[PDB]
Swiss-Prot record, chains A, B, C, D:
Highest classification ranks of the organism: Bacteria, Bacillati, Cyanobacteriota, Cyanophyceae, Synechococcales
SUPFAM superfamilies: Enolase C-terminal domain-like, Enolase N-terminal domain-like
Active-site feature positions: 205 (proton donor), 335 (proton acceptor)
Subunit structure: Crystals are solved as a homooctamer, a tetramer of homodimers; in solution is primarily monomeric.
Biological source species: Synechococcus elongatus (strain ATCC 33912 / PCC 7942 / FACHB-805) (Anacystis nidulans R2)
Annotated GO biological process: glycolytic process
Positions with a binding annotation for phosphoenolpyruvate: 335, 364-365, 386
Protein purpose: Catalyzes the reversible conversion of 2-phosphoglycerate (2-PG) into phosphoenolpyruvate (PEP). It is essential for the degradation of carbohydrates via glycolysis.
Binding site for (2R)-2-phosphoglycerate: 163, 335, 364-365, 386
EC number, as in UniProt: 4.2.1.11
Co-factor note (free text): Binds a second Mg(2+) ion via substrate during catalysis.
Catalytic activity: (2R)-2-phosphoglycerate = phosphoenolpyruvate + H2O
SMART domains the UniProt entry points to: Enolase_C (SM01192), Enolase_N (SM01193)
Positions bound to Mg(2+) 1: 242, 283, 310
Name of the protein this chain belongs to: Enolase
Length: 424, 424, 424, 424
């Protein structure tokens, strides 16, 4: 009786950008409480779960989530009495209650909040940490963090075309050391920016967006930072990029460093960059619908560098399955609130894993104090996590959770970067 | 037996600025776990508790806290077996174990981590929320938030002399509405900055530090933002300032807007500002040791505006007691890690309260996902909290906790701004 | 305290062939009991865990396991007090206690018995079925059974060169239906043998070994049986083979149907067979050390048919990792007692899964009433199990366990054959 | 309240021959679960309980048990709320619910499955092993096993007229040693068959059915096997036979070794065999209805050899009572599913015991992984069990249970063969 759902509550809280989002609280008959918060999503997109916004222009600029919060009342009616242990039954019950493919009815934000809060409730009921609850006794791999430090494209006011430049401490012996390497490189980077008179205000993810002139300037900055912190680029701290090519793709052409390129040109740009720079991963190097050219990119660089689909796959098992069939990418970003249940997320990670694709567990721009993605990364042995820079506690709280997990695993703790489960 | 301490653990985590800090975990014989994290402090200052840094230049730029974390082992030896309910006994036991006035030996960061983790453990043991555990059945007052939005002085690269400009939703019917008013003003402010081509990268506290020319420009910006969001300055959303005058005080002179002033000049500047602008509070308007001139400032503006000591008092009961005796200030910033135990913090709030001074429960620059100061504010009916802007979840998590508290108090929930426990 | 190991006992029992083996019984402080039995292994082989036999010629023809049973006393000394939940810690503790690479000291049979009995104890402690304990909330896939029906080579007295001919109900909607299809084909086969005056006594695995003249005769018999039971060969019931080529390989030559072949000849034989017959899988088609020719076989048939390494890999993560690197096989037989702990078995299945190899969970010739491999198959979503024919309850008990698992998963039950996790 | 029946479930599983049978699962209010499986029975016979088959020719060749499984739903309605401790009340409730003498309505297979599952549930509730639950504190006697090794008559394709030839380790000091003697004789027998070029495929019970010419050849084979294993025939390992004379009885005549005999001839054949060979027991030596001649056989050999009724009595208390009255046999085979409840089985064993008849607890041809008959043998101090050869785990699992029972009884363990409760 004890694991049966007794109560499900939701309220409107704020994310890390000061915008409404949903949290849910699940009480079991044995007194177990699970609390989960949902990050910022999208209300739009063919292959993405739709979060429900109120669109009331006189509240929170129409970004209220009173309707999603009210819909949790209808989920409570449907789920009261079910075992919290039956995650798949619970998730299927909410999918059917919603009855729409993109969860437009109840809201993805309502459904995911209950989906995670149930899982937290159930792990507390069994007195298991969430990573062990979800992953069983081999859930022992700390991910290589891909750590935001420089922003461009739509995430900046500068002449950098690519969206995110990241460091990855691939060479560290432990997550605890990997995190310290990240932080020291981030503080060395701050000092270099100050010394060059560049702005050191941070953006959504806790990284810098100084007024730089090119993608090259960004990569050169990260190399200076790594070396000033005393680490070896590539061997110890490698580079990664979110190209978000969709942002600068118009009519079969990609505009990059003032010039227009055909797919074959953009591919060549990416190939020159991985030649010149210790880049171990590239996300959305080509546009979300440029599949024939994605196939060439994968054929050419796929065995030498990670090729992450984000907008390419939108955590959608049909798009990922198509990618797998066509030799497109070798890695996929996993966003819980892009698909909308824990079950469907785990199915999508399993599909990636079985096909030799790497799963990169990802934050959203609008994050919360929730640390679920840390446990999700360890549960699935994903080997990588993307949860922002080395400032802002909606980013830092995931690393602190990973430190607690690594300590608790003790002598069983493995670091992905040391056992071949990293990007390279 | 159940509330007796069974285990006390600590580890090195990261704060919101990517710098090491301490968290402690307290296990009771009944299985109750309390976890607390400590914000960034100071290793220096006569009247402040000293946090212990490792000063190992090859780790975290010498800001490691391995020694503080190890000292928690010596606290566990001292406290194992004591009831977690006896907060004062526990806090006195750590003070004696340290045996130094400024907690230099064990570290303030080690002592406060155990002090809070014990209190969280004890409230969980009794199944009470922390605010009720600490404050008893009248702990029912949601504080007026003083919300960072514009930064100057040592917290910016601009020509603004004052350190912090804040909004305070004094006129809201509830904390839930007060928080929405704050967020809408913050998003209107962002839009005004973008439209004027000013930088919108955020600093430590989640506010903006655009290149403005004067304190006046800052105040005019907040008024535009308030009005653009559709609120009435003063009646609905009032202004507050952290002058941090210590930063621009040299030899009995205060340099402010290009000119040098004698105390009487600086006082006059403050008096003109509260005349022209709906400023309901001023922090560190005069230097931390300028007591005769503090007495004049208090005599002149004290009955018309809140005068907050921060550097003036450093949460120190002797300095506060001196202030009370001399008619200096009418409000005090309360920083847990400036004094170093929960007991001594509560004594200092009681001393302020009994003497008609307002307590403003304060964050630090280096914050964590910890939400203790939200419960501390409600427990003591402090009526005000200062926990940063409307972005970064080390700030936002305190407001989300206050939303959970307000919901749980239900029909017993009171907002300080509506019942005369605010700044004005 | 409750999951802590209180007692570990072992005794000498009999396997399905009337030969000694080990069972272990683990008691937890909360009264949870786990019991496991180990199947027949080998005392020999470079890359295999060594089971410990007594070699006392006056007992059980020297196949006694009194020494392995006594060694469990030394494991109890090492493990008493450890949480049964910490499977990896427990397994590593026994590996270190043994201190030999092939577990020659304590015995693989002693170590695996405690390894499984601990896992059963822990799942009972948490009140979870073993598949859910090991696999988490997505452990919902019933495997396609590869069902022994005709034996040749070293497992018969006949002129059939290949060792095992199997049916696989790939086309069934459920494991419950798949099992019925298997049983009906097996009873139709028995009738065909009786009607042709061929022997219907069964061997170790519960299949037939009639005096047939060729591999072709075996395949033609299974096709008659399938059709007489009213099923469609390939679409509904497909064929699989254990070639065990090591048995008829001498000096770079394979003797098959009276003729000697070079690797390229044997490959051609296999290619003609998959052309003529609905064969969806081939095990040990080439010799255990014939790696260059394995590479050709995989290159030629790998995308059209499953190529299972058994003697090729001996459930050894180094041999499997080599195979993966060299494009050798696309599937691996998983034998718990070939590696000797549950942890190392799960690591080996994870390694196969991540590299796009299929895991086939396998019985041994000497089996017991233990049903662990059924739960192991569902826990890891392996998608295939090889646990003998449709007679002898050491084989049938695994299918009865799979029926209990499918019933308990309810609407969440998936059949590997219907969702693309089968051989084809 | 705790021993009250909360739930009774059944499902269709497979027996050791790949044919459907029933298992039932009984849950008590205290969480106790009992699971039992039923062996193959008969749907026909005047004095036998009728198992219910579906007779649907398109499923399992009409041997489905969906109807029996559904009838367990009607038993659950009748029994929910009754104490599982009240075995007799439960068994009488099912007998009345069925309302037919041969349990044709619900099915013997449905009724016995619930009857055993209840008893297992109740013993688990009291934390007693089943033998102690049923037999009280003197349940301490391990039976002499009668172990199948050679088959003839309707159970073979050969010229052996008698149906079963068995060894019985009457001279062993313990069941643990008795089992080893059995296994060593069985492995010596296998070797003799291989060396003579005779088939070593096994039948239903895990024994051999080589193409032998006579009953004499069978007896001579067992003597060679016993001696080759190094044991003394008679003193250490004795012989037993299932004549199943009904199979070769037509019109007052018994055809045996090519000749027709009158009852007095068949009796003489049996008398010569016990003269020449160390035969300690004979089952169905004369036809199931040949009572006057059974009386002569018993008068002549009864004080020198065990005379077991199987088809003679069909575990029926009226036929056994008639036998007792007429001096027919001195032993009875006990088959749970021939009578259909545990209560009626125990009544029938009590009736045999009180009248000086030996009870031989018997398997069926279609057996399962269930081990109830091992506990039944020890509970009733029956002193003999007939549960097949030394291969196939539906046979071996009963011996493994007897090993667990003997270990658990410790210094209180008695072997029937050593204390005069055996066949001789
Ligand atoms: Ca529990
Ligand atoms: Ca730009
Ligand atoms: Ca992206
Ligand atoms: Ca270590
Ligand atoms: Ca309590
Ligand atoms: Ca300045
Ligand atoms: Ca200040
Ligand atoms: Ca109200
Ligand atoms: Ca438990
Ligand atoms: Ca042969
Ligand atoms: Ca094989
Ligand atoms: Ca269904
Ligand atoms: Ca009890
Ligand atoms: Ca015959
Ligand atoms: Ca018989
Ligand atoms: Ca003894």
């Amino acid at each position: 009786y004890g694991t049966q759902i007794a109560e499900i509550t939701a309220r409107e809280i704020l994310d890390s950008r000061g915008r409404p989002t949903v949290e849910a609280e699940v009480h079991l008959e044995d007194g177990s409480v699970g609390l989960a918060q949902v990050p910022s999503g999208a209300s739009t997109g063919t292959f993405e779960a739709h979060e429900l916004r109120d669109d009331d222009p006189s509240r929170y600029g129409g970004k209220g989530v009173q309707k999603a919060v009210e819909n949790v009342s209808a989920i409570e009616d449907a789920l009261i009495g079910l075992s919290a242990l039956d995650q798949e039954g619970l998730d299927k019950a909410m999918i059917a209650l919603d009855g729409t493919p993109n969860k437009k009815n109840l809201g993805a934000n309502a459904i995911l909040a209950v989906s995670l809060a149930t899982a937290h409730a159930a792990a507390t009921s069994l007195n298991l940490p969430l990573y062990r609850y979800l992953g069983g006794p081999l859930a022992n791999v700390l991910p290589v963090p891909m750590m935001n430090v420089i922003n461009g494209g739509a995430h900046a006011d500068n002449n950098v075309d690519f969206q995110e430049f990241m460091i990855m401490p691939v060479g560290a012996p432990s997550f605890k050391e990997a995190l310290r390497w990240g932080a020291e490189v981030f503080h060395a980077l701050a000092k270099v920016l100050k010394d060059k008179g560049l702005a050191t205000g941070v953006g959504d993810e806790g990284g810098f967006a100084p007024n730089l002139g090119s993608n090259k300037e960004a990569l050169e900055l990260l190399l200076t930072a790594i070396e000033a912190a005393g680490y070896k680029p590539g061997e110890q701290v490698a580079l990664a990029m979110d190209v978000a090519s969709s942002e600068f793709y118009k009519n079969g052409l990609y505009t990059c460093d003032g010039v227009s390129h055909e797919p074959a040109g953009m591919i060549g740009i990416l190939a020159d960059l991985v030649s010149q720079y210790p880049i171990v991963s590239i996300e959305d190097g080509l546009q979300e619908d440029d599949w024939s050219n994605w196939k060439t990119l994968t054929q050419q660089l796929g065995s030498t560098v990670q090729l992450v689909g984000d907008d390419l796959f939108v955590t959608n098992p049909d798009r990922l399955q198509s990618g797998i069939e066509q030799g497109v990418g070798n890695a996929v970003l996993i966003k819980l609130n892009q698909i909308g249940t824990l079950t469907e997320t785990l199915r999508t990670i399993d599909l990636a894993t079985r096909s030799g694709y790497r799963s990169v567990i990802s934050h959203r721009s609008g994050e919360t104090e929730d640390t679920t993605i840390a446990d999700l990364a360890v549960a699935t042995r994903a080997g990588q996590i993307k949860t922002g820079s080395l400032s802002r506690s909606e980013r830092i709280a995931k690393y602190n959770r990973l430190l607690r997990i690594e300590a608790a695993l003790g002598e069983n703790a493995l670091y992905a970067g040391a056992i071949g489960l990293g990007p390279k």
